[PDB]
Design a protein around this ligand. Structure first.
Ligand SMILES: Nc1ncnc2c1ncn2[C@@H]1O[C@H](COP(=O)(O)OP(=O)(O)OP(=O)(O)O)[C@@H](O)[C@H]1O
Ligand SMILES: Nc1ncnc2c1ncn2[C@@H]1O[C@H](COP(=O)(O)OP(=O)(O)OP(=O)(O)O)[C@@H](O)[C@H]1O
Ligand SMILES: [Mg+2]
Ligand SMILES: [Mg+2]
Ligand SMILES: [Mg+2]
Ligand SMILES: [Mg+2]
Ligand SMILES: [Mg+2]
Ligand SMILES: [Mg+2]
Lengths: 425, 427
């Protein structure tokens, strides 16, 4: 481990304060957007005397980045930008980010830290299935595994049959991949009559989208691995903003020596005490090219005390604020549905939620599949469909039309699964 | 200009001496640590210390594709697993992909040689590089990426596909250099023109095109269309990846081989005899500095000739004529797709897109050349008729081959995303 990972909280705090002061000054001096934002908010970098003072400073939102496209957020000259990446476009036009060579180095060290936290060992191979390209996931995973001194197998997305061929042949110890795509790889392993538990894989590091504890336990049992959660977003850096320690599996530990977290009430912008659910906000402490100050992530979670590290954790992401569905008056996230689906051993872990209107009433249709083994077993499927409907009603408050499709009926994820098709318009 | 390394123009005497020392090391490393080379050298009755000068290299046995295939996945490796930093693979063009590995030192060298290649293309401080080569197990994309990043440039790691979006980002990000296959460049150019833009007025100044053969005539065509300088970069996964050799933009006289790291020979592919420089034959490489996968006298199956250094001390290769695998035998006459390309490009009424289809009709090899009009000339039936006839005549009179010229509609030929499939052999 790095010394900082077990430093005292006093030591960490002091380090954060020094770096936050630097970052605020760097943004104000070198990022025209932040000179304007700070002036129009009536604050100066000098106003930060303690970490609690961060709440004086304005927020940065997606809109700020969209307005400055492509390169208006940068705080260094274009000749110092070593790398361009973009967000994935999930909510709209991708936003563009940049990195100096030092920022690439920092990112590589943080992803390496996250891979260590997952339980990596000298001699491990890493099979990277996160997409390579303008997306931050693939190249971020790549550089971090390479920095960790491991054997990098840079496969990227797609070609499921080939990925399974190479998992057999190359015997990777670690896979870095979305949890939804992991399911497709697991299916393919089983489709070929192989036993996925006996795969060489020891560790899965899954991120890029929400996945429940229930999902983790299912995947762990099916693949014979430890699975840990890695979090990031492109505005802040990419994967490796936070990652779970495999010895606790209690939500990603935030690398807050580099990215300082807050939680706010999304409606008011007020800061909440640790433990309360709301919107996750980050400020970069060491970023050169694109310092980012109080970025409202639109990801919903809560901050929790350090366990396996000095650094605090986040709870597993509940969802994006954009993920929230309002169904006949009840607010529901896809993860809530997923938790109930994963109780049914007779059903696959694949799903899609389709929202419609029938007259004036909302209708939520949950499309599921049997496991391939259970498909012919009508009695098992029938119990599953009824128990799932009863769990969603009793625990979530929504009446879900459960619709069991043939095996392979649901379009498989290519990366970030689309959990929801809202046809209500 | 971005700086030359001193070795790039140091004396040939100094270069020879350092090649010899590195070759002695590489042969020992292979023999001592690669269990395949221990077997190969022992069976040929040679030992590393048989190499006294560079002229002795042709005493050593060849390595072929089959050697690699027989060693899948990791049988060629010459360092322990925990020193392997990276796995890549060949593209599968001719069969099952062959797997290669790299230590950290290897990855560093590769990044240095791709940077050297990008500098040779005329890159400048502050340039943005749009990388359109595929990212993944293929060596191209990550090889280009690391090299552009090592040169200190601004890397835009797009990768393959999504042509409309690549064009949007060529507009929005205004890159200076694009690294891409010549056949996929053609698609990008089409899409620029389709979105109503003048491709000459693109921000791009330099195209660095490899991964497949493309003629000097194709070069001049793309240069005029895009308003760029276009240079050729060569590589193959067994040897390293892209950056084995790269053209100097000031001479455009075929890729200069980085023979401080990869020592080239040319052989008669039938006999294995080494040919004097200047004669066409099969290219053969020996790595001088590689750790994880030393490769000794690898028979590339690429056909070319060696030429004296011009812009560098290092020798050049001619632009690749083709793979051995590309050669068609058509009614007793040997013909390469690049020869067909040269004639196609004389026709201003026809696009630069093509694909050859080989069938048999009784005794006859039928070579059908699928072409398209230019967008502007598609409705001009007379111009297209003359282009067809003139192209058939050129192929017959200059190559000795009867071809059927099949004019498809615009977009009738499946577009390349990387290495175009030039020949579909249905015989
Ligand atoms: N471990 C994870 N848990 C749940 N969500 C995750 C995790 N890792 C990443 N995400 C989601 O992915 C987002 C980062 O993705 P990225 O920056 O590539 O673009 P995006 O948010 O998908 O698309 P866009 O910003 O264009 O709408 C995070 O903010 C979060 O919503
Ligand atoms: N600049 C170039 N001009 C001509 N052809 C090239 C050039 N660069 C690379 N190539 C071709 O690509 C080959 C290297 O590609 P790679 O190692 O990815 O696998 P492949 O040869 O296409 O597939 P496989 O070896 O599996 O049949 C070269 O040997 C050559 O045939
Ligand atoms: Mg986002
Ligand atoms: Mg296992
Ligand atoms: Mg189940
Ligand atoms: Mg090959
Ligand atoms: Mg131009
Ligand atoms: Mg033409």
């Amino acid at each position: 481990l790095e010394p900082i990972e077990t430093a005292s909280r006093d030591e960490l705090t002091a380090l954060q304060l020094e770096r936050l002061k630097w970052s605020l000054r760097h943004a104000y001096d070198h990022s025209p957007v932040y000179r304007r934002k700070f002036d129009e908010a009536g604050v100066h970098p000098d106003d930060l005397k303690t970490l609690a003072d961060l709440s004086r400073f304005p927020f940065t939102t997606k809109g700020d980045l969209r307005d400055s496209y492509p390169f208006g957020m940068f705080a260094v000259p274009q000749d110092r930008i070593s790398r361009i990446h973009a967000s994935s476009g999930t909510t709209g036009k991708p936003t563009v980010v940049g990195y100096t060579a030092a920022d690439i180095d920092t990112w590589a060290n943080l992803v390496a830290r996250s891979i260590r936290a997952a339980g990596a060992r000298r001699g491990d191979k890493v099979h990277v299935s996160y997409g390579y390209g303008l997306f931050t996931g693939g190249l971020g995973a790549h550089y971090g595994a390479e920095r960790a001194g491991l054997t990098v197998i840079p496969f990227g997305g797609g070609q499921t049959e080939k990925q399974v061929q190479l998992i057999q042949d190359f015997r990777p110890d670690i896979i870095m991949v979305t949890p939804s795509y992991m399911l497709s790889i697991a299916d393919e392993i089983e489709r070929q009559g192989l036993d996925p538990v006996q795969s060489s894989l020891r560790i899965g590091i899954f991120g890029a989208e929400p996945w429940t504890n229930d999902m983790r336990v299912a995947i762990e049992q099916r693949m014979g691995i430890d699975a840990v959660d890695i979090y990031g977003l492109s505005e802040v850096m990419g994967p490796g903003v936070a990652s779970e320690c495999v010895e606790t599996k209690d939500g990603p530990t935030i690398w807050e020596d580099h990215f300082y977290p807050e939680i706010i009430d999304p409606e008011t912008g007020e800061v909440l005490p640790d433990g309360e659910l709301g919107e996750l906000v980050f400020t970069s402490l060491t970023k050169e090219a694109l310092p980012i100050i109080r970025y409202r992530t639109r990801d919903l979670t809560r901050l929790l005390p350090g366990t396996a590290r000095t650094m605090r954790r986040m709870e597993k992401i509940t969802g994006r604020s954009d993920d929230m569905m309002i169904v006949r008056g009840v607010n529901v996230f896809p993860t809530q549905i997923e938790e109930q689906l994963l109780k049914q051993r007779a059903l696959a872990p694949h799903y899609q939620i389709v929202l419609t209107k029938e007259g004036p009433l909302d209708v939520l249709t949950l499309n599921v599949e049997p496991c391939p083994e259970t498909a012919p077993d009508t009695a098992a499927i029938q119990v599953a469909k009824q128990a799932l409907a009863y769990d969603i009603k009793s625990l979530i408050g929504v009446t879900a039309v459960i619709n069991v499709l043939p095996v392979n009926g649901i379009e498989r994820s290519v990366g970030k699964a689309r959990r929801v098709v809202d046809k209500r318009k």
